[PDB]
Design a protein around this ligand. Sequence first.
Ligand code: NI
Length: 341
Amino acid sequence: TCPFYKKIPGTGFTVDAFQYGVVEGCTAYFLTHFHSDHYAGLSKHFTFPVYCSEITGNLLKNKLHVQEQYIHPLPLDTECIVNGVKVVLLDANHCPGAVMILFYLPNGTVILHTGDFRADPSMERSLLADQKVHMLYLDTTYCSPEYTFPSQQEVIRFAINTAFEAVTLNPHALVVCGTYSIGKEKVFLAIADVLGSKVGMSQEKYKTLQCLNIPEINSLITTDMCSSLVHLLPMMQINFKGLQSHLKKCGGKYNQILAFRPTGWTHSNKFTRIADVIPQTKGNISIYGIPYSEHSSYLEMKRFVQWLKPQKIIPTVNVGTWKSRSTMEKYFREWKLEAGY
Ligand code: NI
């Protein structure tokens, strides 16, 4: 049974609610982005209208085989009528194709559903500038002040400089980057660009990347692993055992691996600066954990909400414990008292 925080009152609509069977009263299922916790339940046998971005719709058709007649892609930044209700899709600054949804209810209420997002000051000059929001369904993944991390640009500067130094010292070093979902593609694209290489990967991952509308992608990626000195591997293989095994497979072309695991936050964030990050090393294998987030930090979240001034907040993450729920409600009240709304 579908939880209340996935339902949009006064409509026939749900958000990210595909794992509950046929939801009573739902005439249109929205999907914010192609991450498995959110698409869970979709397949080629789904027969209700799915509303989403163009990029999400490419992934639903090619990767999950949803039939075309049920996929309804909408352009971004554009007023659209769906089943008699005005909606707008906005870029969420999450993974490729990820959106926030603005719903203009028939009674005058305006609702923003952030899906998963990384708040940014640029959102203060989107179509959100133009009117009031009564209800905010908020991605609260990192809603506590201990969650700090650097900008995505500082993290990519660290990765490029680290990889370029290592491979210039040793032209026989291989770079490996972990992946288990879409998102974070700048990590491996930026490193391959500094090295003058295409990124090598499995056929299944190449297929996924070909759905993402990235400009000039054919110039940047390949399935020919041997021609490439940046390889992508499943995240589970980014450990000393998995990397040793991979180095065997390259037929003595390489004699060193430098590997990256983009995680979200880890508690080494509460003590270490990005500049001071060091790898774990064993022999000719080194592994860096780099804090590349596609979710808001605490401070970015707080800035967004204090600017938007919603009348009510409904968290969509960390909702399963009473301690989490009470913590989040306390910070919402602080923010509202400090700003005066
Ligand atoms: Ni996500």
